[PDB]
């Protein structure tokens, strides 16, 4: 021996490798997840209580931890040394939640807000410049404590100025909105029933113009949508299908607390919305009477943590009731990853979860005060 | 869904689903139409709950007939998923029953919910 129909036969001959290299591919694989563990963040300086909250600095390579030890332990995460930058003990203030903040306009501004089961909240400008917020300006009845608070960006359209806002959970369906810097009571928002969780979504309008929307949910499943650029007026009402005993809610695919922006143009809308419950189901909604795209059922306990990847491709959902109750979900496939976590994966009673803004790092806190770090090789 | 009558309102569904979730923990809840049917045959049911959205709704239209004959309270909720949710099972439940127990630790609100369902009927 010595279009053409035999094209496909020839190309098979050329290579024995037929799986497309995932390096060029930018969409992570559906079922296989490439994760490698790194050294613990607190290994340099252990925490004496549970890691109540975790927060990555938006730009600088810093990680913030808080807990009932009453200290703001911040770590310089590099993946190999993870030494401690500084620590700030706050006597008589158990730490239930803490977070970094950077003014969307003045990038030089850096602040940390920490709160607990108290009638006051502390801010830390970046001896320490610490300041306490303890005045509600007549709305003291609606609120009993600042233990649950999130920080968002509000644009005053009439002047086009942008500033931060501190959101609080009221006693009876109430949400109190305070000025980030001046602490002034800006507006108040109400829903029927007991407020369980809330989040923030941003909808860009035009060049330099965006609106902030408050999403609030009752334990039953009614969801309220409030326009904070229009004095916190209702704009939409809908129910979570099959929802009962809601516990948490979050959005993803755009800017958020976990994935803050650095300038106005970076503001992006979230295309995902997920809602938890005490039993453990999570209804996923495509924000683009709504019907859930998927109803995850892998965990069998209360949803204590629910967070989206900065790109909105992975959902990290956790429960504090039992040990190792942590699952990662691929999006938009809505399929839980199998290879990780494993039986030998050390997670314990998960209580805090954090996604790095970039680099694809995972920080997971447990009751024992251990923050275990992982890297996603895909990013 | 005109057949399902009386249908509990949003507020009334709250307390019913709350009791159902409680009855699940204390093993005082019977889940499923036939299992609900058995309780009515044995006369051990405080009252019967059904889901309005179930399709075909005729699968549960027998329980009102049993309940009326046995003078047992009954009521419909809008969503079957939410019913099975409160029951504490991974599948939709279109009907469930609360077993009679005068020695239960959750007795009072069952009568309270029962008294309201009397008012609804």
């Amino acid at each position: 021996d010595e279009g053409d129909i035999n094209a496909l036969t020839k190309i098979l001959s050329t290579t024995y490798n037929y799986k497309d290299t995932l390096s060029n591919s930018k969409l992570l694989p559906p079922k296989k997840l490439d994760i490698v563990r790194l050294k613990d963040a607190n290994a340099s300086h252990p925490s004496h209580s549970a890691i109540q909250s975790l927060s990555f600095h938006p730009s600088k390579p810093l990680l913030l931890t808080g807990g009932y030890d009453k200290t703001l332990r911040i770590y310089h995460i590099d993946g190999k040394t993870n030494h401690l930058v500084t620590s700030l003990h706050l006597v008589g203030s158990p730490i239930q939640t803490c977070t970094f903040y950077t003014s969307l306009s003045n990038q030089n501004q850096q602040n940390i807000f920490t709160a607990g089961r108290r009638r006051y909240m502390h801010s830390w400008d970046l001896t320490a410049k610490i300041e306490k917020f303890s005045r509600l300006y007549g709305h003291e009845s609606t609120q009993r404590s600042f233990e649950n608070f999130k920080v968002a960006h509000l644009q005053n359209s009439q002047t086009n100025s942008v500033h931060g806002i501190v959101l609080l959970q009221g006693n009876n369906g109430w949400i109190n909105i305070l000025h980030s810097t001046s602490g002034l009571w800006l507006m108040g928002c109400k829903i029927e029933g007991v407020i369980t969780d809330f989040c923030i979504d941003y909808q860009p309008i035009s060049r330099g113009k965006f609106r902030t929307i408050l999403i609030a949910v009752n334990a039953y499943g009614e969801v309220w949508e409030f326009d904070l650029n229009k004095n916190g007026h209702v704009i939409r009402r809908w129910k979570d299908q099959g929802g009962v005993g809601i516990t948490k809610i979050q959005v993803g695919g755009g800017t958020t607390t976990t994935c803050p922006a650095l300038q106005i143009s970076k503001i992006k809308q979230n295309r995902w919305l997920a809602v938890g419950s005490e039993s453990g189901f999570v209804n996923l909604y495509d924000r683009n009477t709504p019907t859930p795209v998927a109803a995850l059922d892998q965990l069998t306990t209360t949803i204590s943590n629910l967070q989206f990847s900065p790109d909105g491709q992975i959902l990290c959902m956790a429960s504090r009731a039992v040990k190792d109750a942590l699952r990662l979900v691929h999006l938009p496939s809505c399929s839980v990853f199998s290879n990780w976590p494993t039986s030998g994966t050390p997670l314990g009673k998960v209580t805090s979860v954090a996604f790095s803004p970039s680099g694809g790092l995972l920080a997971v806190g447990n009751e024992q005060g251990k923050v275990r770090l992982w890297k996603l090789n895909h990013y | 869904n005109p057949k399902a009558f009386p249908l509990a309102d949003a507020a009334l569904t709250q307390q019913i689903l709350d009791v159902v979730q409680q009855a699940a923990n204390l093993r005082q809840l019977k889940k499923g139409a036939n299992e609900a049917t058995k309780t009515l045959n044995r006369g051990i049911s405080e009252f019967i709950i059904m889901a309005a959205d179930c399709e075909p709704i005729e699968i549960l239209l027998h329980l009102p007939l049993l309940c009326e004959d046995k003078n047992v309270p009954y009521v419909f909720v809008p969503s079957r998923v939410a019913l099975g949710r409160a029951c504490g099972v991974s599948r939709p439940v279109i009907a469930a029953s609360i077993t009679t127990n005068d020695a239960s630790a959750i007795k009072t609100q069952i009568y309270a919910v029962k008294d309201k369902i009397e008012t609804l009927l």
Partner: peptide, 12 residues
Amino acid sequence: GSKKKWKKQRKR
């Protein structure tokens, strides 16, 4: 069952 007294655990 879990039987901690039964622990609150979902049935799959």
